[PDB]
Design a protein around this ligand. Structure first.
Ligand SMILES: CC(C)(COP(=O)(O)OP(=O)(O)OC[C@H]1O[C@@H](n2cnc3c(N)ncnc32)[C@H](O)[C@@H]1OP(=O)(O)O)[C@@H](O)C(=O)NCCC(=O)NCCS
Ligand SMILES: CC(C)(COP(=O)(O)OP(=O)(O)OC[C@H]1O[C@@H](n2cnc3c(N)ncnc32)[C@H](O)[C@@H]1OP(=O)(O)O)[C@@H](O)C(=O)NCCC(=O)NCCS
Ligand SMILES: CC(C)(COP(=O)(O)OP(=O)(O)OC[C@H]1O[C@@H](n2cnc3c(N)ncnc32)[C@H](O)[C@@H]1OP(=O)(O)O)[C@@H](O)C(=O)NCCC(=O)NCCS
Ligand SMILES: Cc1ncc(C[n+]2c(CO)sc(CCOP(=O)(O)OP(=O)(O)O)c2C)c(N)n1
Ligand SMILES: Cc1ncc(C[n+]2c(CO)sc(CCOP(=O)(O)OP(=O)(O)O)c2C)c(N)n1
Ligand SMILES: Cc1ncc(C[n+]2c(CO)sc(CCOP(=O)(O)OP(=O)(O)O)c2C)c(N)n1
Ligand SMILES: Nc1ncnc2c1ncn2[C@@H]1O[C@H](COP(=O)(O)OP(=O)(O)O)[C@@H](O)[C@H]1O
Ligand SMILES: Nc1ncnc2c1ncn2[C@@H]1O[C@H](COP(=O)(O)OP(=O)(O)O)[C@@H](O)[C@H]1O
Ligand SMILES: Nc1ncnc2c1ncn2[C@@H]1O[C@H](COP(=O)(O)OP(=O)(O)O)[C@@H](O)[C@H]1O
Ligand SMILES: [Mg+2]
Ligand SMILES: [Mg+2]
Ligand SMILES: [Mg+2]
Lengths: 549, 549, 548
């Protein structure tokens, strides 16, 4: 009995817990996709590997096991570097499997001969070309384990065509056991006590809940910690829903005030990177104190010093914090000048946006449109939200009630992830509704993948919030002077639903919003709802712009 | 008087002969696109940088000056690596300009902070981050010159946002003169004589005309050489049209016989790489002798030894060959057993395909559909042809009469280039019709760019030859078992023309072909013609498959 | 009041805990070495950056803060990549600071213009070119912290000449506080319990003590763990001395038997890499069970599956194991079939080597020479031991009694480290004797650094065990057919002591060993002892070669 390299790879992947594979077939990886389907891995054929490789990283975030992207040699693999870099930037587990030319044609100018390991290297924890067919399971298990152990990240496997198509006797192949979940590392008890003692000295304490806490599956421990301590908290964009967004201790609507004035912040799986304005003035106080909880020791003390470091797994360390609070109870008072100032700011920002939610002017505004989207999203739906103002106002208006239910442009700020992340969510969660809310520019980066969603019967509804460009475009184009970020005015993207026999809707007036969105979400194929908005509409005013520089 | 980095870069690019810029704006490169338009560079806003970066390389091939791709920091630049690699593989001049985060935020986890120089490195002749605003023109001229001097190739410029947005006094900036065309290097006269003498010893000589001869603009000298010597010749796929494809000395229809039996080949700007089966058995004779004309000395003698090396520019060396033939006339006899065998093979392959051109069976075949496309392509049109069998049979059926009028997947075999290369051709040749003939899979890699063609008023007609997948897909999909390379059956891609107000046509029967194609090509917006074909249709049988392994 | 980039860098390095800098000056880094000395960093000018860069990584191992290598632009930096790679291979904290050409000359073909960041990249956790003079302390702190937090490793700082020589106002510069010691992470309680439960099921358990335990400074807890449990243990080559090598539970003289027959091993900061034969047959049992203690989660389960993963700091995790043994006491019985077999192999291997220690044949053998070296080494000396058989037999014959007192070719198997590691050890431990024991080939990789040791008054004695080549060479060279690994027969390397006015000794017969070594170790300048041995002498025979 013999077996091919392709069949060994597919068996090993399934044994290691891979359940989802996204890519595009061609020389030399056709038999890998075929073998993956026979092993029961779900294979999705995309229209571009760029989108497929973003889907793979999203699987890693959602499941804690790497999604796999399968790409042909040369340009196929290079298209997939996009997803390597997005997983690198977000510390998400993901594997790109790239075919390569037959090894005995190296140097000859073989079909799609390319330095693929060197191209992947900057973005991966692990890059390997297996030396022989019979050792393939060694490399598969090592790749999988390296993506999920330590700080999670990306890996690249380089498979020459002759390793894929060649055969060995089955008896020559040893398969490792399934890589177990990594141990959930703990902080020293002295550091646990030091974190809690420091909290008790703060006049204006703040907890930030980030997507590291979501990735760790720490949501029960984090909610218990925040409720026991009574602390104000802020969710990062993909930390939304770790604690339900309607929780009374959320100060999301006073975010700028909270960061500017806190004297002590607890970072629960969140970085002091650009998203948090580096922890630095003018957005933070120059003397802010930091308790930092991260699996990555090297991240501790980036940009601003850390007073108490909690290095390890967020679920395990937050459980240590909760155990120590049970031993030595403490909570932050419910009546303080901090709470009063936070509540004043929340109420003022609520009053500012309320008229915008209720403005029926045409062309419509973001808040008016997102109001009706919000009121029709099931509470356990997964939201894929991508764009500039479409995503930023979507972040504030569309709540999440469960962890890991918002997928957006994330740390790398990537356009091109929307449909791929929606398809990943549908594959992981076949029983949920997926709502994809994209700006019109965002939609165009991967718009062909609406047919992919349709072909695999995925429960995704596509909503486009269209202002004619990248932050808007004019109503009529001057052919001699097309703005660099404009598109065809009133582009009818919803006609793309006719490609696969779905329903497309073109919305311009507020009386259309509720009936159209309700009907669209009920369709047995993915509907596309193309909603025109004013090119003057934008977010509620802020003292500071989001891009600190 | 002061000037920004963005304005300096745009002025320098225009001074160096850059006329075409393709990309997507965003932080930090918005002011570069604006300044490029003010300087009179044509800027095209794409839906994905992947397609834009392929457009830039095509400009390099068509014009001999680099096309420029403009990309934002991080994922924008990484999307554009695709075009770097395609230009690397084809030795085409091309520049990717990537924004980068502000330099004073390095190390902080800045927005879209990424190792962009290291990501570009494997594919570029030149990668630089300018050290200061006032030296920007030094780097622009050095990048341009490096892409077109020597063996042409790709370059990457890394521009931190503060170099783009900062200003200096105009008096601090020196601008180099426009980089002149590189000198057209000559072979030693002894080698010229040796090449011609070797030709006179051959019993079965063959000339191969490749896209290096096209790039060199050598078409007048090459045609004169082939006609003076009376030699049989074969065009490579993008060498088609250097000599008009209806020339009586073409042996294209006997290609396999010609390569298998020639005893001496003249490579005029063509590599012995995978496209030519490495010059090795079983597709070539083991003792074949090679005269090799290439600008790259390092390419000489790859895979098979070269008997006479002609290193330098193809136009200049072919002129040397023609001058020596005028001094010492010679021609290959018109009546030889070689010619008789070539003509026998041509006639047999003509007889094999003639019934296929005339078969009206539905679902239709490739040859029947391509017959009617061929008969409506203007003789000076530019053809963009991409796919597997759509491109390979398009290569044989659709003739080219002028040099540099076919753009296809080229050396890297890339899917994703079709629409971008058509847009590049339209930008370079505003007075010509561009016909883009894509397989259905090929179409989906960059299908959103039909709106880009429409928005800029480009004279492109999109034809899709649709067999439901990558080499075909079934007529009905089993939801539990979707073939990895299949798409939605009878996908109505022509409805994408409704996005921008163009006309879409759905063709299934042969009586539709001529009226539909005629009307589509006459439209003032880009039409999409979606032509269904049998999933059993394929190319005429061959003794060997194209992928030697 | 203004300050240069060079002065900022030196102040930042000192503040971050850097104490030792090794390198060679020239354009553009001259002012950095001067500023370093003014800050009280110890600077050593070497004869080659290659040796200097190995010294920097050894400081990191010995101290837990990176040593720094200072190199000029272009070839200076490239010579120092050797030390980046050695630190990478051993997970030692180390910084290479390379000068670069002036930034405004990039692209021009500037003096020593080179792609230095890309050259360092494969071996470093961190590589940065500071964007501006005022942010230099940001990069220094970030580089230091990255080398010592998590799995320790190397960093590269790329300093253009105009960042070094340029100035800013002092008020423009902010200095981060000294990087605190890294947090010492712990294993889940259920894993601590599972480790101890597994030990109680084992018929033939074994502890392996590696240089990760030494780097962690876990020696007190490791000794307590091994003594409490009564387990047999094996030290890795640089794990020697974490427990004193004369400890009764060491099974070093039964190494192959122990690895072949153990059914459950506790890896205390040691890898299943080539040095442990990948944990695989034929050197290990196919069904061996593994409890693995390592700070690197990604290392867990390499080559063979791990049954209990103890991810975190070795000192902290061993303290966890000790605390649970206090609650639930257990020890391995002192009379078992396993102990009886281990002791039988120990006694047989002892009987095999005893006549080699007492063999007075000339030319001499390794064991007879190393016997007299051993008996003169002070118990708290640092040993630098490098070569092939010189190092491999030195490993078994020369005991260590304290942690971090043996420095050898380590995980990368590097020749070129011996003098640089001895100089590093002298700098870290000015109160100790440093003894450097090298094969003749190893000596030649960095032999000019004996003058560096003399110039800085370091308490180092250089011993060369000389068999005329790489594993030996002939007594007479056929001048037209020189064997690729041979050197001049009876090459008088000890005459190099005359370069700096030291004492060189040439030894051929056993009566000379003891008086020569005693006198040499007492010299006020570094002495060189060049000891000839037979080119037929070799190590004790083994069933298996070390290179699996
Ligand atoms: C960096 C970043 C996290 C900074 O956050 P931000 O945009 O300043 O703030 P938020 O989106 O949380 O909230 C915006 C404003 O609405 C307020 N707000 C939030 N929820 C609210 C609510 N329910 N009611 C009223 N106001 C609310 C906030 O307090 C803030 O106003 P403020 O500055 O006066 O406090 C965020 O801008 C981001 O993720 N940007 C992504 C950029 C990107 O990647 N683009 C695509 C590439
Ligand atoms: C590698 C490559 C150059 C090899 O060429 P090929 O496909 O064998 O040959 P051609 O396309 O020139 O011609 C195909 C056949 O049609 C014949 N032919 C060509 N023109 C003809 C004509 N007008 N009438 C009849 N027959 C004709 C040829 O002689 C050959 O038949 P043969 O093998 O019996 O001689 C070519 O296959 C190629 O470029 N492939 C691209 C693959 C790719 O990149 N795919 C997408 C990724
Ligand atoms: C990989 C490596 C750890 C393998 O260890 P090894 O060489 O097989 O074993 P050791 O050096 O620990 O011991 C060698 C032999 O001496 C024995 N021994 C050790 N101490 C002893 C003592 N005091 N008395 C008697 N015998 C002793 C051992 O049991 C072993 O014999 P065995 O195989 O019969 O058990 C080791 O060879 C190594 O580090 N090599 C470095 C290679 C290099 O970098 N070269 C340059
Ligand atoms: C790969 C890549 N390329 C480009 C960008 C730059 N970029 C933005 C943020 O840097 S965001 C946006 C779309 C906004 O346009 P939109 O979706 O229509 O949303 P809206 O504001 O008009 O509502 C674009 C193109 C990017 N981030 N990533
Ligand atoms: C970037 C990238 N990704 C994938 C491939 C693999 N690949 C092919 C050649 O290796 S070709 C083809 C389309 C054929 O399908 P098609 O267009 O519908 O043409 P047709 O034969 O059915 O007529 C595909 C997907 C590739 N080359 N480059
Ligand atoms: C940088 C580098 N270059 C070469 C080697 C290969 N190499 C050895 C590996 O095992 S070891 C040794 C010397 C043995 O010769 P020696 O010192 O005289 O010792 P001895 O056995 O004769 O007693 C040499 C040269 C190396 N490891 N690193
Ligand atoms: N299991 C885990 N426990 C704790 N931290 C984790 C875990 N997995 C990832 N992380 C950390 O979570 C942090 C998430 O930061 P970031 O992506 O910036 O979050 P956000 O964008 O939500 O602020 C990263 O620094 C990462 O190392
Ligand atoms: N100006 C020039 N003169 C001669 N050769 C050139 C010139 N420019 C590029 N080339 C060479 O032309 C060759 C084209 O080969 P290739 O791309 O394989 O052609 P094809 O695909 O048409 O066979 C390359 O090796 C390249 O170095
Ligand atoms: N503080 C620490 N605690 C635990 N493990 C550590 C620590 N520092 C380094 N390590 C680990 O120690 C291991 C040492 O293995 P190695 O260098 O192979 O040792 P040896 O050569 O002694 O077998 C490395 O895998 C490294 O990740
Ligand atoms: Mg928009
Ligand atoms: Mg097709
Ligand atoms: Mg020797």
């Amino acid at each position: 009995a013999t077996i091919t390299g392709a069949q060994i790879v597919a068996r090993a992947l399934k044994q290691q817990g891979v359940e989802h594979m996204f890519g595009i077939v061609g020389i030399p990886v056709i038999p890998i996709a075929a073998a993956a389907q026979r092993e029961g891995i779900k294979f999705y054929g995309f229209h571009n590997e760029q989108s497929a490789s973003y889907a793979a990283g999203a699987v890693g975030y959602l499941t804690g096991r790497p999604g796999v992207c399968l790409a042909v040699s040369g340009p196929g693999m290079i298209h997939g570097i996009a997803g390597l870099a997005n997983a690198w930037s977000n510390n998400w587990p993901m594997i790109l499997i790239g075919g390569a030319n037959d090894s005995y044609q190296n140097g000859q100018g073989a079909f799609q001969e390319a330095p693929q390991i060197e191209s992947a290297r900057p973005y991966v924890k692990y890059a390997a070309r297996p030396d022989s067919i019979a050792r393939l399971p060694f490399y598969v298990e090592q790749a999988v384990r390296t993506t999920i152990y330590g700080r999670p990240g990306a890996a690249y496997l380089d498979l020459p065509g002759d390793i894929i198509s060649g055969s060995v006797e089955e008896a020559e192949v040893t398969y490792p056991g399934r890589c177990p979940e990594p141990p959930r590392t703990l902080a020293p008890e002295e550091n646990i006590k030091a974190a809690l003692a420091a909290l008790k000295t703060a006049e204006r304490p703040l907890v930030i809940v980030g997507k590291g806490a979501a990735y760790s599956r720490a949501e029960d421990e984090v909610r218990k910690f925040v409720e026991t301590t009574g602390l104000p908290y802020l969710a990062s964009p993909m930390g939304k829903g770790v604690i339900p967004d309607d929780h009374p201790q959320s100060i999301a609507a006073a975010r700028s005030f909270a960061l500017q004035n806190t004297d002590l912040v607890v970072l629960m799986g969140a970085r002091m990177n650009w998203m948090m304005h580096f922890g630095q003035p003018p957005r933070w106080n120059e003397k802010v104190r930091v308790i930092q909880m991260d699996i990555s020791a090297e991240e501790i003390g980036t940009n601003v010093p850390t007073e108490v470091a909690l290095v390890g797994d967020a679920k395990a360390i937050t459980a240590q914090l909760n155990a120590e609070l049970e031993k030595n109870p403490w909570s932050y008072p419910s009546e303080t000048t901090w709470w009063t100032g936070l509540q004043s700011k929340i109420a003022a920002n609520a009053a500012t946006v309320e008229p915008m939610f209720n403005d029926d002017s045409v062309p419509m505004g973001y808040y008016r449109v997102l109001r009706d989207i919000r009121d029709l999203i099931p509470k356990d739906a997964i939201i894929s939200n991508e764009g500039a103002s479409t995503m930023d106002i979507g972040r504030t208006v569309l709540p999440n009630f469960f962890a890991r239910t918002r997928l957006d442009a994330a740390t790398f700020g990537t356009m091109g992830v929307g449909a791929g992340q929606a398809i990943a969510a549908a594959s992981v969660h076949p029983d949920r509704k997926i709502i994809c809310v994209q700006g019109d520019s965002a939609f165009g980066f991967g718009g062909m993948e609406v047919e992919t969603a349709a072909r695999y019967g995925l429960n995704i509804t596509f909503v486009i919030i269209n202002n004619n460009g990248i932050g808007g475009g004019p109503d009529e184009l001057d052919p001699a002077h097309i703005p660099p970020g404009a598109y065809t005015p009133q582009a009818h993207y919803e006609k793309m639903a006719d490609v696969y026999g779905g329903k497309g809707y073109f919305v311009t007036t507020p009386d259309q919003l509720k009936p159209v969105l309700e009907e669209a979400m009920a369709q047995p194929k993915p509907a596309i709802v193309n909603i025109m908005i004013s090119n003057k509409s934008g977010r509620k005013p802020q003292e500071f712009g989001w891009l600190t520089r």
